[PDB]
Design a protein around this ligand. Sequence first.
Ligand code: NAD
Lengths: 204, 196
Amino acid sequence: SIPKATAKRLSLYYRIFKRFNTDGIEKASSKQIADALGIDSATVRRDFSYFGELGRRGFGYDVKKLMNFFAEILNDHSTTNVMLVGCGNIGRALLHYRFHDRNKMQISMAFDLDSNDLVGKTTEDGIPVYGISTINDHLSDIETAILTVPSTEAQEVADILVKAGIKGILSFSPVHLTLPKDIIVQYVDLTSELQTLLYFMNQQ
Amino acid sequence: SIPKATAKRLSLYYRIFKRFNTDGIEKASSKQIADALGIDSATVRRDFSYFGEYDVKKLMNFFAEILNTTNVMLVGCGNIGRALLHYRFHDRNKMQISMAFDLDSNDLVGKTTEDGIPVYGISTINDHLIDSDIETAILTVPSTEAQEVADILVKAGIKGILSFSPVHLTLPKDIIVQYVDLTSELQTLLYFMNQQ
Ligand SMILES: NC(=O)c1ccc[n+]([C@@H]2O[C@H](COP(=O)([O-])OP(=O)(O)OC[C@H]3O[C@@H](n4cnc5c(N)ncnc54)[C@H](O)[C@@H]3O)[C@@H](O)[C@H]2O)c1
């Protein structure tokens, strides 16, 4: 039963193991993993204690097998249909992207405000685009949403989606949402990421 | 003297105290904050030890103070890249993309975006940098090119890279790299939903 903070690191560990794997490294020390990741080697070690037999020795981690252990935790769900809400910019890009088959996830419908051009039309990639008005009637097994609408619509729209039965939200809107307890929300705030980057550069 | 892990959370606290200060809220709890971010209520308390002091207007100033004239370079004008060239980063815009780069052979090179962002050929990055305040790069090239282009950025004197490729960049220890990896961000959402 992995701890939350450990789980947030899964995809970081996948990334670093992939690259070791690409470079021909069979075996890695927790020190090497820490140094590449820029975290405390003792954190690598408490994390890896949760990753079964492959991680239970503080050293000589098998790079091929753990790379795969990580990919397979992160793909351990059935095929998930996802809706996109906000076919603006950053949404325009996600709207066209087709996730690798292994990921067992796809954007199967898109939404924008009814004055938008794309409503009614359909993408050359295959995805129909409906008005945020048609949201409630247009649900289905979809539980998961990507949200890319402007700061000022964010909360309003998430509330529509939550009321419509959405349990998970990947939000790009740079505003903090307040939603029922049981609703999962994961944020990618671009401005906050640049601010963090810029703060570490300014530590010199 | 902030620890690395408290520092990662700084810009997350700023966005919450902005939100309280619009709702008109005067003070907030280690409780309220931990809830908002889905981190231990404790872990907040210990972060906040390093802030000397919870009044919202004051702390929203402390985080604005600590986080705040920044021009950014964008490298790789494809799907994502062209999306970010139209993306606004700030209210009173403290953060901007001033120029962009793609392969010299790309149709977009030698053009200026509708918002006045010039686009140059990657071969010229040294010229355009030996004069500029630019220390920061957003990297939006195919995964297969990300390392190699990151090596060119660092050579040209870039100190920070926000990368959108899901590929680990091995760069000198002084370079700060931050990842926005959209596929794995969605998998991570998926992971938490299937736990809860
Ligand atoms: N499109 C999405 O919704 C999305 C989703 C998940 C991951 N990503 C990742 O983000 C990255 C960007 O993705 P994308 O789909 O926009 O890529 P893309 O192929 O559409 O665009 C890449 C751009 O890089 C330019 N380029 C190639 N080599 C260069 C170099 N040497 N110097 C300067 N420019 C160069 C190309 O001409 C092109 O304009 C990729 O790693 C991709 O896997 C994107």
